[PDB]
Every structure is written in C-alpha cells, then in structure tokens.
Amino acid sequence: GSSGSSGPATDWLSAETFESDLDETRVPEVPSSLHVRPLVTSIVVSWTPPENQNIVVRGYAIGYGIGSPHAQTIKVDYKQRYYTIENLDPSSHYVITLKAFNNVGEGIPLYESAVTRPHTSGPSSG
C-alpha cells in the first residue's frame, strides 16, 4: 500500500444548527391551511406551514385523485411551498390533500377541492 488514502470535505450551507430544542417529541399536527388552484391541464397546490415554527418538519405529502387522494401521492421537501401537478385531466374534480409528517410521525391530512378548467381545445372566450 501507499500511505493509504482519505476523503476530505468542507463547505458552507444555509440552515439552523438542527437545534435539539426544537419540538421534535411530537408529530406536526394539521398545517395552518391548504390552498389549491385548478388549471386546465394542471393544478397549483399551494400550502402553508403550521403557525408554530418550532416543530421539526421534515416534509409533507400531497395526495391527488378522482374520488380519493389515496390514488396517488407526491412527497417533497419542506422548502417547497406549492406543487404544480402537470399532465392532468381537465374538466375533472381532483381531491388534493396535505399532511405534515416528521421523524416523530405523521399528522392529520387535509381535504380540498380543485376543478380543472374545461380545455375544450380552447378555453378562450369563456
């Protein structure tokens, strides 16, 4: 062998020091609220964090699907404030849900409604 080897690393980041003080002993209950904007062939799902900015929130879950959100689910990072679900089906009521989950566990999901606009090969003049 030749003086073995190693792997140095160093860099700066923008975030707190994972303070243990933060409330991480319980799960993040339902968020402040959840807004959804139905689009022709898309849907801008905009949500908001819980008033309490002390609970450690790893990420949230976005469930969508006609009849029930269980159909499909999308997971993202906390930073993410809203998700634009593209390649969807117009003229259809999509049930979007949102639930806060952390290392402690999952919370209570929300119930919303978003009716995509009628494509009609040209929603103009409507």
Side-chain angles (χ1 to χ4, degrees):
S2 274
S3 64
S5 282
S6 199
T10 181
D11 210 294
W12 84 320
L13 72 315
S14 204
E16 75 194 327
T17 312
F18 187 70
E19 207 84 312
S20 67
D21 152 70
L22 298 163
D23 196 321
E24 198 194 292
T25 187
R26 78 183 272 85
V27 303
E29 56 151 36
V30 54
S32 55
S33 210
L34 155 76
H35 165 244
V36 290
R37 171 192 199 69
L39 271 89
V40 181
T41 57
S42 308
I43 301 184
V44 179
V45 180
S46 75
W47 59 92
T48 47
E51 270 90 328
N52 201 359
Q53 280 270 269
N54 305 128
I55 308 160
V56 171
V57 177
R58 289 272 193 202
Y60 314 83
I62 302 153
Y64 68 90
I66 292 89
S68 210
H70 289 276
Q72 276 309 283
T73 301
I74 298 163
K75 286 285 195 71
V76 293
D77 286 295
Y78 47 89
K79 297 195 89 270
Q80 287 36 57
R81 209 270 282 201
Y82 70 96
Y83 200 92
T84 299
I85 310 166
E86 288 185 289
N87 34 92
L88 285 173
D89 179 79
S91 269
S92 271
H93 161 222
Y94 272 85
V95 179
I96 295 84
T97 53
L98 183 84
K99 70 172 88 169
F101 70 91
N102 72 345
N103 76 289
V104 179
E106 309 71 75
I108 29 278
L110 284 164
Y111 272 64
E112 273 306 316
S113 79
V115 181
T116 45
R117 290 202 69 201
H119 206 303
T120 49
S121 72
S124 202
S125 200

